[PDB]
PDB file of all heavy atoms in Angstrom:
ATOM      1  N   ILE A 598       0.916  -1.212  -0.049  1.00  0.00           N
ATOM      2  CA  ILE A 598      -0.069  -0.024   0.019  1.00  0.00           C
ATOM      3  C   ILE A 598       0.852   1.244   0.018  1.00  0.00           C
ATOM      4  O   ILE A 598       1.829   1.305   0.749  1.00  0.00           O
ATOM      5  CB  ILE A 598      -1.023  -0.021   1.163  1.00  0.00           C
ATOM      6  CG1 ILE A 598      -1.978  -1.199   1.010  1.00  0.00           C
ATOM      7  CG2 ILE A 598      -1.723   1.355   1.355  1.00  0.00           C
ATOM      8  CD1 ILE A 598      -2.698  -1.387   2.314  1.00  0.00           C
ATOM      9  N   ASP A 599       0.504   2.175  -0.902  1.00  0.00           N
ATOM     10  CA  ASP A 599       1.130   3.522  -0.989  1.00  0.00           C
ATOM     11  C   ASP A 599       0.477   4.507  -0.066  1.00  0.00           C
ATOM     12  O   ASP A 599       0.969   5.038   0.803  1.00  0.00           O
ATOM     13  CB  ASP A 599       1.109   3.890  -2.591  1.00  0.00           C
ATOM     14  CG  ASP A 599       1.743   5.236  -2.808  1.00  0.00           C
ATOM     15  OD1 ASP A 599       2.342   5.897  -1.820  1.00  0.00           O
ATOM     16  OD2 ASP A 599       1.490   5.849  -3.845  1.00  0.00           O
ATOM     17  N   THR A 600      -0.845   4.873  -0.382  1.00  0.00           N
ATOM     18  CA  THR A 600      -1.578   5.617   0.498  1.00  0.00           C
ATOM     19  C   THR A 600      -2.974   5.192   0.719  1.00  0.00           C
ATOM     20  O   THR A 600      -3.490   4.319  -0.048  1.00  0.00           O
ATOM     21  CB  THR A 600      -1.710   6.980  -0.061  1.00  0.00           C
ATOM     22  OG1 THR A 600      -2.277   6.894  -1.357  1.00  0.00           O
ATOM     23  CG2 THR A 600      -0.250   7.577  -0.351  1.00  0.00           C
ATOM     24  N   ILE A 601      -3.717   5.581   1.782  1.00  0.00           N
ATOM     25  CA  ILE A 601      -5.006   5.416   2.115  1.00  0.00           C
ATOM     26  C   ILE A 601      -5.655   6.698   2.428  1.00  0.00           C
ATOM     27  O   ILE A 601      -5.175   7.585   3.189  1.00  0.00           O
ATOM     28  CB  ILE A 601      -5.084   4.470   3.363  1.00  0.00           C
ATOM     29  CG1 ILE A 601      -4.503   3.113   2.977  1.00  0.00           C
ATOM     30  CG2 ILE A 601      -6.564   4.345   3.779  1.00  0.00           C
ATOM     31  CD1 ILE A 601      -4.441   2.237   4.290  1.00  0.00           C
ATOM     32  N   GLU A 602      -6.872   7.040   1.763  1.00  0.00           N
ATOM     33  CA  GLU A 602      -7.668   8.171   2.157  1.00  0.00           C
ATOM     34  C   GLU A 602      -9.040   7.750   2.550  1.00  0.00           C
ATOM     35  O   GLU A 602      -9.766   7.160   1.829  1.00  0.00           O
ATOM     36  CB  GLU A 602      -7.813   9.027   0.891  1.00  0.00           C
ATOM     37  CG  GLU A 602      -6.496   9.342   0.183  1.00  0.00           C
ATOM     38  CD  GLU A 602      -6.970   9.699  -1.292  1.00  0.00           C
ATOM     39  OE1 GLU A 602      -7.582  10.660  -1.552  1.00  0.00           O
ATOM     40  OE2 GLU A 602      -6.414   8.963  -2.221  1.00  0.00           O
ATOM     41  N   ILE A 603      -9.443   8.114   3.752  1.00  0.00           N
ATOM     42  CA  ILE A 603     -10.813   8.128   4.220  1.00  0.00           C
ATOM     43  C   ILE A 603     -11.468   9.512   3.822  1.00  0.00           C
ATOM     44  O   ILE A 603     -11.052  10.578   4.308  1.00  0.00           O
ATOM     45  CB  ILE A 603     -10.969   7.930   5.696  1.00  0.00           C
ATOM     46  CG1 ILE A 603     -10.236   6.629   6.131  1.00  0.00           C
ATOM     47  CG2 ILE A 603     -12.310   8.061   6.077  1.00  0.00           C
ATOM     48  CD1 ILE A 603     -10.968   5.337   5.485  1.00  0.00           C
ATOM     49  N   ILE A 604     -12.498   9.547   3.030  1.00  0.00           N
ATOM     50  CA  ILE A 604     -13.102  10.811   2.391  1.00  0.00           C
ATOM     51  C   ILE A 604     -14.011  11.392   3.543  1.00  0.00           C
ATOM     52  O   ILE A 604     -14.836  10.664   4.083  1.00  0.00           O
ATOM     53  CB  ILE A 604     -13.685  10.559   1.142  1.00  0.00           C
ATOM     54  CG1 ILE A 604     -12.769  10.114  -0.002  1.00  0.00           C
ATOM     55  CG2 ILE A 604     -14.398  11.770   0.542  1.00  0.00           C
ATOM     56  CD1 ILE A 604     -11.589  11.080  -0.197  1.00  0.00           C
ATOM     57  N   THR A 605     -13.748  12.611   3.800  1.00  0.00           N
ATOM     58  CA  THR A 605     -14.710  13.496   4.581  1.00  0.00           C
ATOM     59  C   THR A 605     -15.304  14.726   3.807  1.00  0.00           C
ATOM     60  O   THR A 605     -14.754  15.133   2.765  1.00  0.00           O
ATOM     61  CB  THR A 605     -13.966  14.012   5.768  1.00  0.00           C
ATOM     62  OG1 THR A 605     -12.891  14.824   5.324  1.00  0.00           O
ATOM     63  CG2 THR A 605     -13.387  12.953   6.594  1.00  0.00           C
ATOM     64  N   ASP A 606     -16.471  15.196   4.368  1.00  0.00           N
ATOM     65  CA  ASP A 606     -16.874  16.433   3.904  1.00  0.00           C
ATOM     66  C   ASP A 606     -16.050  17.604   4.294  1.00  0.00           C
ATOM     67  O   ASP A 606     -15.587  17.642   5.400  1.00  0.00           O
ATOM     68  CB  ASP A 606     -18.292  16.769   4.508  1.00  0.00           C
ATOM     69  CG  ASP A 606     -18.999  17.798   4.032  1.00  0.00           C
ATOM     70  OD1 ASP A 606     -18.597  19.068   4.376  1.00  0.00           O
ATOM     71  OD2 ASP A 606     -19.827  17.841   3.199  1.00  0.00           O
ATOM     72  N   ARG A 607     -15.653  18.448   3.158  1.00  0.00           N
ATOM     73  CA  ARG A 607     -14.594  19.357   3.535  1.00  0.00           C
ATOM     74  C   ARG A 607     -14.978  20.392   4.530  1.00  0.00           C
ATOM     75  O   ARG A 607     -14.204  20.748   5.367  1.00  0.00           O
ATOM     76  CB  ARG A 607     -14.282  20.053   2.262  1.00  0.00           C
ATOM     77  CG  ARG A 607     -15.450  20.857   1.588  1.00  0.00           C
ATOM     78  CD  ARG A 607     -14.942  21.657   0.365  1.00  0.00           C
ATOM     79  NE  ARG A 607     -16.061  22.714  -0.052  1.00  0.00           N
ATOM     80  CZ  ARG A 607     -17.067  22.458  -0.707  1.00  0.00           C
ATOM     81  NH1 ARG A 607     -17.498  21.213  -1.196  1.00  0.00           N
ATOM     82  NH2 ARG A 607     -17.952  23.405  -1.015  1.00  0.00           N
ATOM     83  N   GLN A 608     -16.291  20.917   4.535  1.00  0.00           N
ATOM     84  CA  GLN A 608     -16.721  21.862   5.494  1.00  0.00           C
ATOM     85  C   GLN A 608     -16.945  21.296   6.894  1.00  0.00           C
ATOM     86  O   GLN A 608     -16.612  21.801   7.911  1.00  0.00           O
ATOM     87  CB  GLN A 608     -17.931  22.471   4.937  1.00  0.00           C
ATOM     88  CG  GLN A 608     -17.818  23.126   3.584  1.00  0.00           C
ATOM     89  CD  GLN A 608     -16.790  24.251   3.591  1.00  0.00           C
ATOM     90  OE1 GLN A 608     -16.316  24.409   2.405  1.00  0.00           O
ATOM     91  NE2 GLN A 608     -16.408  24.792   4.635  1.00  0.00           N
ATOM     92  N   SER A 609     -17.751  20.244   6.893  1.00  0.00           N
ATOM     93  CA  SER A 609     -17.983  19.552   8.227  1.00  0.00           C
ATOM     94  C   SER A 609     -17.021  18.668   8.895  1.00  0.00           C
ATOM     95  O   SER A 609     -17.203  18.354  10.104  1.00  0.00           O
ATOM     96  CB  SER A 609     -19.464  18.846   8.086  1.00  0.00           C
ATOM     97  OG  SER A 609     -19.193  17.570   7.527  1.00  0.00           O
ATOM     98  N   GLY A 610     -16.166  18.132   8.086  1.00  0.00           N
ATOM     99  CA  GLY A 610     -15.321  17.088   8.581  1.00  0.00           C
ATOM    100  C   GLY A 610     -15.972  15.645   8.725  1.00  0.00           C
ATOM    101  O   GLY A 610     -15.295  14.697   8.996  1.00  0.00           O
ATOM    102  N   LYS A 611     -17.214  15.570   8.463  1.00  0.00           N
ATOM    103  CA  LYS A 611     -17.910  14.341   8.684  1.00  0.00           C
ATOM    104  C   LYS A 611     -17.393  13.323   7.645  1.00  0.00           C
ATOM    105  O   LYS A 611     -17.198  13.614   6.473  1.00  0.00           O
ATOM    106  CB  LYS A 611     -19.405  14.422   8.511  1.00  0.00           C
ATOM    107  CG  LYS A 611     -20.321  13.354   8.504  1.00  0.00           C
ATOM    108  CD  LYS A 611     -21.504  13.423   7.443  1.00  0.00           C
ATOM    109  CE  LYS A 611     -20.939  13.240   6.135  1.00  0.00           C
ATOM    110  NZ  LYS A 611     -21.618  13.901   4.925  1.00  0.00           N
ATOM    111  N   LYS A 612     -17.183  12.047   8.153  1.00  0.00           N
ATOM    112  CA  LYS A 612     -16.950  10.974   7.263  1.00  0.00           C
ATOM    113  C   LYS A 612     -18.081  10.687   6.116  1.00  0.00           C
ATOM    114  O   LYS A 612     -19.284  10.625   6.551  1.00  0.00           O
ATOM    115  CB  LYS A 612     -16.596   9.672   7.829  1.00  0.00           C
ATOM    116  CG  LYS A 612     -15.152   9.836   8.620  1.00  0.00           C
ATOM    117  CD  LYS A 612     -14.814   8.416   9.210  1.00  0.00           C
ATOM    118  CE  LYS A 612     -14.030   8.556  10.579  1.00  0.00           C
ATOM    119  NZ  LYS A 612     -13.081   9.704  10.609  1.00  0.00           N
ATOM    120  N   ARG A 613     -17.638  10.473   4.891  1.00  0.00           N
ATOM    121  CA  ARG A 613     -18.735  10.343   3.877  1.00  0.00           C
ATOM    122  C   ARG A 613     -18.966   8.920   3.531  1.00  0.00           C
ATOM    123  O   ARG A 613     -19.872   8.702   2.712  1.00  0.00           O
ATOM    124  CB  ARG A 613     -18.294  11.095   2.623  1.00  0.00           C
ATOM    125  CG  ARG A 613     -18.469  12.689   2.836  1.00  0.00           C
ATOM    126  CD  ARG A 613     -18.063  13.365   1.525  1.00  0.00           C
ATOM    127  NE  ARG A 613     -18.886  12.905   0.458  1.00  0.00           N
ATOM    128  CZ  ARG A 613     -18.645  13.101  -0.805  1.00  0.00           C
ATOM    129  NH1 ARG A 613     -17.571  13.718  -1.278  1.00  0.00           N
ATOM    130  NH2 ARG A 613     -19.506  12.683  -1.807  1.00  0.00           N
ATOM    131  N   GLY A 614     -18.325   7.988   4.279  1.00  0.00           N
ATOM    132  CA  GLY A 614     -18.656   6.580   4.059  1.00  0.00           C
ATOM    133  C   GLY A 614     -17.915   5.849   2.958  1.00  0.00           C
ATOM    134  O   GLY A 614     -18.459   4.740   2.409  1.00  0.00           O
ATOM    135  N   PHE A 615     -16.834   6.420   2.340  1.00  0.00           N
ATOM    136  CA  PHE A 615     -16.075   5.693   1.529  1.00  0.00           C
ATOM    137  C   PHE A 615     -14.636   6.228   1.444  1.00  0.00           C
ATOM    138  O   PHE A 615     -14.370   7.172   2.183  1.00  0.00           O
ATOM    139  CB  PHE A 615     -16.694   5.914   0.095  1.00  0.00           C
ATOM    140  CG  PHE A 615     -16.626   7.332  -0.413  1.00  0.00           C
ATOM    141  CD1 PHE A 615     -15.653   7.786  -1.374  1.00  0.00           C
ATOM    142  CD2 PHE A 615     -17.731   8.134  -0.176  1.00  0.00           C
ATOM    143  CE1 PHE A 615     -15.815   9.009  -1.882  1.00  0.00           C
ATOM    144  CE2 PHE A 615     -17.731   9.530  -0.746  1.00  0.00           C
ATOM    145  CZ  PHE A 615     -16.675   9.891  -1.511  1.00  0.00           C
ATOM    146  N   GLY A 616     -13.658   5.483   0.764  1.00  0.00           N
ATOM    147  CA  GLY A 616     -12.300   5.880   0.926  1.00  0.00           C
ATOM    148  C   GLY A 616     -11.639   5.153  -0.334  1.00  0.00           C
ATOM    149  O   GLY A 616     -12.224   4.583  -1.185  1.00  0.00           O
ATOM    150  N   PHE A 617     -10.374   5.440  -0.457  1.00  0.00           N
ATOM    151  CA  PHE A 617      -9.492   5.047  -1.468  1.00  0.00           C
ATOM    152  C   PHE A 617      -8.249   4.330  -0.945  1.00  0.00           C
ATOM    153  O   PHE A 617      -7.642   5.012  -0.035  1.00  0.00           O
ATOM    154  CB  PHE A 617      -9.042   6.101  -2.499  1.00  0.00           C
ATOM    155  CG  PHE A 617     -10.217   6.676  -3.115  1.00  0.00           C
ATOM    156  CD1 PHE A 617     -10.954   7.885  -2.672  1.00  0.00           C
ATOM    157  CD2 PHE A 617     -10.748   6.084  -4.395  1.00  0.00           C
ATOM    158  CE1 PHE A 617     -11.916   8.369  -3.327  1.00  0.00           C
ATOM    159  CE2 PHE A 617     -11.837   6.716  -4.973  1.00  0.00           C
ATOM    160  CZ  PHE A 617     -12.420   7.924  -4.554  1.00  0.00           C
ATOM    161  N   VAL A 618      -7.817   3.199  -1.583  1.00  0.00           N
ATOM    162  CA  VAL A 618      -6.638   2.577  -1.258  1.00  0.00           C
ATOM    163  C   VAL A 618      -5.752   2.528  -2.593  1.00  0.00           C
ATOM    164  O   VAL A 618      -6.223   2.224  -3.600  1.00  0.00           O
ATOM    165  CB  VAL A 618      -6.837   1.158  -0.661  1.00  0.00           C
ATOM    166  CG1 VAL A 618      -5.305   0.536  -0.412  1.00  0.00           C
ATOM    167  CG2 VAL A 618      -7.650   1.203   0.598  1.00  0.00           C
ATOM    168  N   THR A 619      -4.563   3.170  -2.508  1.00  0.00           N
ATOM    169  CA  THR A 619      -3.635   3.222  -3.635  1.00  0.00           C
ATOM    170  C   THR A 619      -2.477   2.308  -3.306  1.00  0.00           C
ATOM    171  O   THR A 619      -1.799   2.365  -2.250  1.00  0.00           O
ATOM    172  CB  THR A 619      -3.104   4.633  -3.879  1.00  0.00           C
ATOM    173  OG1 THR A 619      -4.260   5.516  -4.165  1.00  0.00           O
ATOM    174  CG2 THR A 619      -2.239   4.614  -5.133  1.00  0.00           C
ATOM    175  N   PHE A 620      -2.308   1.249  -4.141  1.00  0.00           N
ATOM    176  CA  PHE A 620      -1.230   0.335  -4.052  1.00  0.00           C
ATOM    177  C   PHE A 620       0.008   0.823  -4.889  1.00  0.00           C
ATOM    178  O   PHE A 620      -0.061   1.798  -5.667  1.00  0.00           O
ATOM    179  CB  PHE A 620      -1.655  -1.037  -4.503  1.00  0.00           C
ATOM    180  CG  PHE A 620      -2.721  -1.612  -3.602  1.00  0.00           C
ATOM    181  CD1 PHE A 620      -4.135  -1.407  -3.901  1.00  0.00           C
ATOM    182  CD2 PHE A 620      -2.413  -2.496  -2.616  1.00  0.00           C
ATOM    183  CE1 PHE A 620      -5.120  -1.892  -3.039  1.00  0.00           C
ATOM    184  CE2 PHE A 620      -3.328  -3.152  -1.839  1.00  0.00           C
ATOM    185  CZ  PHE A 620      -4.667  -2.751  -2.046  1.00  0.00           C
ATOM    186  N   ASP A 621       1.142   0.138  -4.781  1.00  0.00           N
ATOM    187  CA  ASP A 621       2.238   0.473  -5.622  1.00  0.00           C
ATOM    188  C   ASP A 621       2.174  -0.306  -6.967  1.00  0.00           C
ATOM    189  O   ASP A 621       2.910   0.148  -7.900  1.00  0.00           O
ATOM    190  CB  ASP A 621       3.588   0.063  -4.925  1.00  0.00           C
ATOM    191  CG  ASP A 621       3.850  -1.400  -4.796  1.00  0.00           C
ATOM    192  OD1 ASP A 621       2.945  -2.163  -5.088  1.00  0.00           O
ATOM    193  OD2 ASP A 621       4.985  -1.785  -4.610  1.00  0.00           O
ATOM    194  N   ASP A 622       1.139  -1.136  -7.259  1.00  0.00           N
ATOM    195  CA  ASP A 622       1.104  -1.794  -8.409  1.00  0.00           C
ATOM    196  C   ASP A 622      -0.402  -2.062  -8.796  1.00  0.00           C
ATOM    197  O   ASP A 622      -1.349  -2.057  -7.764  1.00  0.00           O
ATOM    198  CB  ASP A 622       1.759  -3.079  -8.546  1.00  0.00           C
ATOM    199  CG  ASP A 622       1.795  -3.717  -9.917  1.00  0.00           C
ATOM    200  OD1 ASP A 622       2.441  -3.223 -10.824  1.00  0.00           O
ATOM    201  OD2 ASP A 622       0.962  -4.730 -10.050  1.00  0.00           O
TER     202      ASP A 622
END
């Protein structure tokens, strides 16, 4: 794994219920 992002609402900070996992391949 390269990076992991848990997505939030930019204004409220609340988690939006999805994210991204970026691998090296």
Side-chain angles (χ1 to χ4, degrees):
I598 294 167
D599 179 11
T600 59
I601 298 171
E602 311 156 59
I603 300 294
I604 297 299
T605 62
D606 181 284
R607 61 179 196 273
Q608 302 301 156
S609 75
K611 170 223 74 206
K612 291 186 213 321
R613 289 180 61 195
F615 66 98
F617 294 95
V618 181
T619 302
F620 294 89
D621 73 343
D622 189 67

